[PDB]
Enzyme design. Structure first.
Site, mmCIF file in Angstrom:
data_model
loop_
_atom_site.group_PDB
_atom_site.id
_atom_site.type_symbol
_atom_site.label_atom_id
_atom_site.label_comp_id
_atom_site.label_asym_id
_atom_site.label_seq_id
_atom_site.Cartn_x
_atom_site.Cartn_y
_atom_site.Cartn_z
ATOM 1 N N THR A 20 0.837 -1.091 0.038
ATOM 2 C CA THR A 20 0.133 0.052 0.037
ATOM 3 C C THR A 20 0.928 1.267 -0.030
ATOM 4 O O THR A 20 0.530 2.054 -0.458
ATOM 5 C CB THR A 20 -1.121 0.081 1.525
ATOM 6 O OG1 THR A 20 -0.734 1.256 1.946
ATOM 7 C CG2 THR A 20 -0.744 -1.293 2.114
ATOM 8 N N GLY A 22 4.100 1.196 -1.170
ATOM 9 C CA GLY A 22 5.073 1.151 -2.300
ATOM 10 C C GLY A 22 6.224 0.208 -1.624
ATOM 11 O O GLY A 22 6.107 -0.903 -1.060
ATOM 12 N N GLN A 23 7.278 0.711 -1.973
ATOM 13 C CA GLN A 23 8.725 -0.003 -1.753
ATOM 14 C C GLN A 23 9.071 0.421 -0.271
ATOM 15 O O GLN A 23 10.089 0.769 -0.103
ATOM 16 C CB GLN A 23 9.649 0.632 -2.581
ATOM 17 C CG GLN A 23 11.025 -0.295 -2.642
ATOM 18 C CD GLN A 23 11.343 -1.144 -4.258
ATOM 19 O OE1 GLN A 23 10.125 -1.232 -4.914
ATOM 20 N NE2 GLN A 23 12.525 -0.927 -4.312
ATOM 21 N N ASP A 138 -0.032 15.395 3.679
ATOM 22 C CA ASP A 138 -0.679 14.050 3.270
ATOM 23 C C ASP A 138 -1.197 13.391 4.663
ATOM 24 O O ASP A 138 -1.095 12.126 4.886
ATOM 25 C CB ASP A 138 0.343 13.159 2.563
ATOM 26 C CG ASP A 138 -0.490 11.929 1.972
ATOM 27 O OD1 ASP A 138 -1.901 12.061 1.503
ATOM 28 O OD2 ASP A 138 0.087 10.946 1.306
#
Ligand SMILES: Cc1c[nH]nc1[C@H]1CCCN(c2ccc3ncnc(N)c3n2)C1
Ligand SMILES: Cc1c[nH]nc1[C@H]1CCCN(c2ccc3ncnc(N)c3n2)C1
Ligand SMILES: [Mg+2]
Ligand SMILES: [Mg+2]
EC number: 2.7.11.1
Lengths: 282, 265
Positions: A20, A22-23, A138
């Site tokens: 969710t 990413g990396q 965010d």
């Protein structure tokens, strides 16, 4: 400039929390077995300084306690020419996200005094970034994590649009607003949306197509809690986070002196109840 | 019902490195054949030569399930990579015509069966070992994705308060995808995605940056990128565009690509 190799210092385990993010990996400090979160970025020469950036960001602004702290970065060489891999390493928050927390609660709603506690923590973290002139940008339930200890920490601060439901009106572009003006108070909006997420299990407009929500946010009046059961103090706090026009939105400091955040007498029990809730699911 | 994929297909790895998400390169455990496998935590259109064929599904249980969707595997990778891997981030003009035509051929098939791809872009356009162009990820969530290949009617905005998907939105994306092949990027790529979502409905139709392209190519772009989707041609109409219709060097082109596929491999 040049950094170091992770081999024998840190190891992937790996992979959070379902891709969710990413990396990003659950990782481990080889010498002490301390866990840590690990971001792995394939690097080039075009990126180069955006990378140099990401690092100084964390090292400078991760040292508060409501922010997951920077550990250090590592270069893990790849076969010549190929893309090397950068290892961005930070504190690990084992108790998952607020999103998860609410998800795993019967009736997907948190007790008021919990919401107070978690909001305050978010605000303390945000206050720290804002005072350093960093806008998080965010804040949503997923970027707010618990420790084993019921400590609250912010992550992912500073080509896809991604999810719009926690976005302040001022950051969505439209004719009225062709340049999408991220201000520090944008975070506070998202904080208010997050409190509702905790109160209701989801953000306002969750039931809508995201494209549609992106269209509506700038046009609707402030979201409100669905239920009448909540305390006036809390209705008031939401209303503070969600002043439509950010020009009149209270500062982080102003919100930290909001009775709903300020007067948390039972925080003692809350921190306890929280740890317990974590451990059970743990 | 649905087999367990154990002994049948092994996840060799994530493809495009996360780019497509939880989608892996699998290999059949006995036969060696390659497939693409989309993995999903859960609760007859692909048999056209320009649509990557669907092989079937497996079931891997359970809570605390995972669904496997198996599909033919496309060796030569995305045309996004191809452009990336092409000196000068430009594909040859007759390369673009051949690829575009194949895109339209797949879309036509989709559209004749009343399906909207919904997401045409260099990344969803894949090449086989043998220089065959095939489409993936057609018309199957909380994330507004990447805006750059989005048709105007698909973006909710001041005069389009309710986004419209229409089979014609695909053709707009096909046009953007051709620019991608021309310049390695869709227009407004240099833009923040949010800013780009704002301009796509507002700006006039995007254009090739260079003056070097053929008249027919400018025209095919112009043809795909009719702002108002009501006034935008059909798949079938575009297949008849000279740029798509008149390809003599198709033979050399296929050759030139198979080669590249191996060279640059
Ligand atoms: C790991 C990293 C390095 N630089 N930036 C990061 C961010 C990536 C976005 C998610 N953020 C998470 C996500 C999940 C997590 N899970 C546990 N602990 C964490 N710190 C954590 N952080 C961390
Ligand atoms: C695997 C799947 C099952 N249902 N929908 C799909 C799509 C997911 C998006 C990417 N699509 C790719 C991406 C990379 C690929 N690489 C090689 N061969 C493929 N078929 C392939 N497909 C396939
Ligand atoms: Mg800290
Ligand atoms: Mg087929």
């Amino acid at each position: 400039s040049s950094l170091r190799d992770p081999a024998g210092i840190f190891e992937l385990v790996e992979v959070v929390g379902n891709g969710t993010y990413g990396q990003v990996y659950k990782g481990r400090h080889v010498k002490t077995g301390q866990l840590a979160a690990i971001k792995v970025m394939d690097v080039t020469e075009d990126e180069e300084e955006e990378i140099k950036l990401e690092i100084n960001m964390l090292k400078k602004y991760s040292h508060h306690r409501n922010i997951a702290t920077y550990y250090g970065a590592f270069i893990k060489k790849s076969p010549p020419g190929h893309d090397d891999q950068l290892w961005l390493v930070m504190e690990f928050c084992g108790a998952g996200s607020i999103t998860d927390l609410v998800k795993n609660t019967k009736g997907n709603t948190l007790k008021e005094d919990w919401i107070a506690y978690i909001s305050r923590e978010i605000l303390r973290g945000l206050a720290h970034l804002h005072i350093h002139h960093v806008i998080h940008r965010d804040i949503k339930g997923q970027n707010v994590l618990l420790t084993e200890n019921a400590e609250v920490k912010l992550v992912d601060f500073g080509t896809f649009i991604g999810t719009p439901y926690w976005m302040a009106p001022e950051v969505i572009a439209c004719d009225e607003n062709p340049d999408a003006t991220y201000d520090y108070r944008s975070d506070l909006w998202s904080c208010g949306i997050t409190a509702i997420e905790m109160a209701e299990g989801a953000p306002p407009l969750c039931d809508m197509h995201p494209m549609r929500a992106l269209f509506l946010i700038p046009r609707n009046p402030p979201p409100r809690l669905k239920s009448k059961k909540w305390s006036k103090k809390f209705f008031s706090f939401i209303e503070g986070c969600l002043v439509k026009n950010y020009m009149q939105r209270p500062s982080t400091e102003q919100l930290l002196k909001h009775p709903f955040i300020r007067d948390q007498p039972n925080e003692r029990q809350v921190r306890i109840q929280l740890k317990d809730h974590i451990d059970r699911t743990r």
